[PDB]
């Protein structure tokens, strides 16, 4: 490690490893100093992370191979190379470091296969095992890290994380049966419903699917409940519901508060948690609004406020419903074809400028009113490409004859002062151009549009369902972060929490071995026997020839 | 040949299930910021639910309702005392001047047409596309 | 019997032909070593 391990990759592996923001980063990084400084134990561990960082491919799989945790060895290596193979700006390097990458990860995953198959219990027993001083954590966290979304997305670890968000109930039932069972508190009527493959009643509460149901249920009766409250009665005095919103909010800001502490780095960078933070924030504001009526219209505007944020509640109600089976995959798509949207946006928009520079040129010399140009720049095209063409102003109804020269009078448009009363706008350039924007935008703009997203879908479909499944996992370990809990005892529980705060890995070598001996069965079925045959049977003439001129040479 | 289009219908209906649902919580958030405008009570759950589910329904199919605030400004007809059946109202003015601010109201109706006339529905049409190309093959079978 | 005759389909007859013509060459030389067996 000192002194064969050299300097060209140890300064810049080093360099990159003071600040990586990856946990493996520093431990690699740890052990590299103490083995330079140095002048269970796990040092086969620290000879394949040797093997692997000068991009020894073969050294490295076989030293792999040697050691005993190939699995999470694999997994690991993998990882690491996947972060550390971008640092360095070589074409050449970064090439090599990918296709090592790949490599082992696709390695792992086909190894994995055959251990699933012979016992699934070993399996799932190996998957969660602390590692010993090689950056411990289970393989699936080592995984969800790692992206590497093809090993996660492989159906046999789907299944056990359906398993785990099941728990304790037995898969044997229909699903709408299960859904109507959650709502029966008895589950001995239930006898057809397989509740397992008063104690059992009791441990039907605790499957976090059932949580999750309960959670739903609750947010959206809390959702019809604010609105209810916001908007059907408001008064100067608050009043009981608005007492009991402010305690259920809270509830939510709470429960949010400990999810952020639980995981503080990540919470900045995720983005859900942003809006509902913002939403939280706005309404802050309203209850400072309606605390002291210092004007008589004073409530009114936070009021508002209070509804803006109402929105952004409403689609948080969409972010956590995302994983429903066969539901949840059509949301993720949208992420990715955003950018149609926003592309879309710029091209419209350039062409709604242009046209409502042209609406005004019929207009008189000097608006000299900001609210009323820009009030109809904008709106009118923005009402052109939905509906109702704004154009008949001035061509489909003529002159209407009502125009506030005055700049005192607010009323919507006006007419260039005719000359002579005669109406000067020319209509041979005006109208046309009214229906080349029509055409440019409501029929080609427009079906513009459904023809892009066509190619966005079939082209990115297959690849969706995979990343709805990763998805899928995220909520389960949420919902197996925080157990199982009712929102109305979850606070109170949160807030006790808080006054309160081996033969595996032999089946595992065993099946490695039998994965070993069906790659070599794979390579050595080319089936080129016939050229060894060959070789024998030249072999066997020559033999026969010799013996034939030694034959000759006795007779002689 | 005219058989074998209705049966695809029946399994494309999961798109017209998912799309509903989504364009529904998009229409019950903008009903909510409509009656945001609206006097501080309406005590009256007829003209409420008429309002919030119908309005937002045609401002997806067609003729926007937004025009109420922006597109017609204020037209000075409400009916502020219950007993008379008339529909939609206008926030009390203040000293005679309407009170609803359009510089935040407008642009949600800009927001909302955009999200559901222009993305959900050309949304549907994508999704409907792959529906068909991709399972097309084996409905001739059934 | 047509699926038999897929299955034979394979055309390795190459394979025994081979192998017949290495038992004539062993077949040949156990005859030439009987040859000089008999000289001798
Ligand atoms: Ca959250």
Redesign the pocket.
């Given at each position: 490690f000192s002194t064969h391990f050299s300097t060209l990759v140890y300064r810049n592996l080093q360099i990159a490893k003071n600040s990586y923001n990856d946990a493996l980063l520093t431990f690699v990084w740890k052990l590299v100093a103490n083995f330079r400084r140095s002048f269970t134990r796990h040092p086969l561990q620290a000879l394949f992370i040797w093997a692997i960082l000068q991009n020894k491919k073969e050294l490295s799989k076989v030293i792999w191979e040697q050691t005993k945790g190939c699995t999470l060895a694999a997994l690991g290596a993998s990882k690491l190379l996947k972060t550390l193979a971008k640092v360095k700006n070589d074409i050449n390097a970064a090439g090599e470091s990918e296709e090592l990458a790949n490599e082992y990860e696709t390695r792992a995953v086909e190894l994995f296969t055959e251990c699933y198959s012979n016992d699934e219990d070993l399996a799932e027993q190996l998957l969660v095992y602390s590692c010993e001083a090689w950056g411990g954590s289970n393989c699936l966290e080592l995984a969800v890290e790692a992206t590497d979304q093809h090993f996660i997305a492989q159906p046999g670890v789907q299944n056990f994380l359906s398993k785990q968000w099941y728990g304790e109930i037995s898969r044997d039932t229909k699903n709408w049966k299960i859904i109507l069972c959650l709502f029966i508190i008895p589950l001995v009527g239930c006898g057809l419903v397989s509740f397992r493959k008063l104690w059992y009643y009791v441990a039907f509460f605790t499957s976090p699917f059932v949580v999750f149901s309960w959670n739903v249920v609750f947010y959206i009766a809390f959702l019809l409940l604010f609105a209810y409250v916001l908007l059907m009665d408001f008064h100067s005095v608050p009043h009981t519901p608005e007492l009991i919103l402010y305690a259920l909010v809270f509830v939510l800001f709470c429960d949010?508060v400990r999810?952020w502490y639980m995981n503080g780095v990540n919470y900045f960078t995720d983005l859900?948690?942003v809006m509902?933070t913002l939403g939280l924030f706005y309404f802050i504001a309203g209850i400072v609004f309606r605390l002291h009526s210092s004007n008589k219209s004073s409530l009114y505007s936070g009021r508002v406020i209070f509804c803006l944020d109402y929105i952004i509640f409403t689609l948080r109600l969409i972010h956590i419903f995302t994983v429903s089976r066969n539901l949840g995959p059509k949301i993720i798509m949208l992420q990715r074809m955003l950018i149609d949207v926003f592309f879309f946006l710029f091209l419209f928009a350039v062409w709604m400028v242009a046209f409502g520079v042209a609406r005004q040129g019929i207009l008189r010399q000097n608006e000299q009113r900001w609210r009323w140009i820009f009030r109809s720049v904008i709106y009118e095209p923005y009402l052109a490409m939905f509906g109702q063409v704004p154009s008949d102003v001035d061509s489909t109804t003529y002159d209407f004859s009502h125009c506030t020269f005055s700049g005192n009078e607010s009323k919507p448009l006006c007419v260039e002062l005719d000359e002579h009363n005669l109406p000067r706008f020319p209509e041979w350039i005006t109208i046309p151009l009214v229906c080349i924007y029509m055409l440019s935008t409501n029929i080609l703009l427009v079906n513009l549009l459904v023809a892009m997203f066509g190619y966005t879908v079939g082209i990115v479909q297959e690849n969706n369902d995979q990343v709805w499944k990763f998805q899928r996992y995220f909520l389960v370990q949420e919902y197996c972060n925080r157990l199982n809990i009712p929102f109305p005892f979850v606070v109170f529980a949160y807030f006790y929490m808080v006054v309160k705060k081996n033969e595996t890995l032999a089946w595992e070598g065993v099946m490695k071995e039998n994965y070993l001996v069906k790659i070599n069965t794979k390579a050595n079925d080319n089936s080129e026997e016939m050229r060894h045959r060959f070789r024998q049977l030249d072999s066997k003439l020559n033999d026969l020839k010799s013996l034939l001129k030694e034959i000759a040479n006795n007779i002689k």
């Open positions: 949010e999810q859900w948690n509902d």
